[PDB]
Subunit: 75 residues, 6 copies
């Protein structure tokens, strides 16, 4: 008879310590933005974006990640 | 007879410590934005975006993630 | 009879220590941006982006990652 | 006997002709203006000006000037 | 006997002709203006100016000037 | 007896002709302007100017000048 044993013990600790996390600045699109269009002709899907777009300031206290994937395929 | 044993013990701790988390600034689209269009001709789907759009300031106290996926396919 | 033994013990610790994490600056698109178009002719999908876009200031307190993948294929 | 003759004839004409005078634009202070003061100490007259100030758009139809000064000092 | 003759004839004409005078633009201070002061100490007259100031767009239809000064000092 | 003759005839004409005078642009201070001061100490008159200042767009239809100065000193 076939015997399957599966006992993965996990004694992990993704710790982080931080005294202070501050004084982050993010200034996108400081400069003047000018666009000037004359006698154009479009014929298909036009996606246009002007100014300051999709700007992210992600500041997480921790940010510790743990990705654990378990698998046991038995055909 | 087939024996299946499945006992994954999990002694994890995704801790984080932070004294202070402050003074984050985010200024998108500071500059003047001017657009000037003359004698254009569009013929399909037009998506247009001007100014400061889709700007994110995500500031989580923690931000600790744990993704654990378990699977046991038995054909 | 076939014997399968599977006991991976994990005594890991992806620690990090930080006294202070501060004074980060990010200024994209400081300069004036001018565009001037005259007598153009487009005939297909146009994606246009002007100004300061998709700028990221990721500042995580920790940032410790642990990717552990386990597999046990048995045909 | 002393004879004084004073007959300055003036056949001047400071004319101007203009078909059309239009489409003047004046946009001062388009950009965002930020000021941040911390732990200052003033001890005398403080004159402070922020934003868009003392901006002039003088557009005169004519603008023809004639300054004529006459004098006849007799000691 | 002393004879004084003074007859300056003036047949001047400071003319100007203009079909059209248009499409003047003036954009001062397009860019974002940031100031950040910390632990300063002033002791005398402080004149401070931030943003877009004292900007002039003088557009006169004519602008013809004639300065004529006449003098006849007799001691 | 002393004879003074003074008859300056003036048959001048400072003309100008212009079909069209247009499409003048003036964009000062397009760029983002940042100032950052820390632990300064002033002791006398401080004149400070930030941003776009004293910008002039003089566009006169004519601009013809005539300066005529006449003098007749007699001691």
């Amino acid at each position: 008879s076939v015997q399957i044993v599966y006992k993965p013990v996990d004694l992990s600790k993704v710790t982080s310590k931080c005294g202070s996390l501050g004084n982050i600045h993010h200034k996108p699109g400081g400069g003047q933005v000018e666009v000037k269009s004359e006698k154009l002709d479009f014929k298909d899907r036009v996606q246009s974006k002007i100014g300051s777009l999709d700007n992210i300031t992600h500041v997480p206290g921790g940010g510790n990640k743990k990705i654990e994937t378990h698998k046991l395929t038995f055909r």
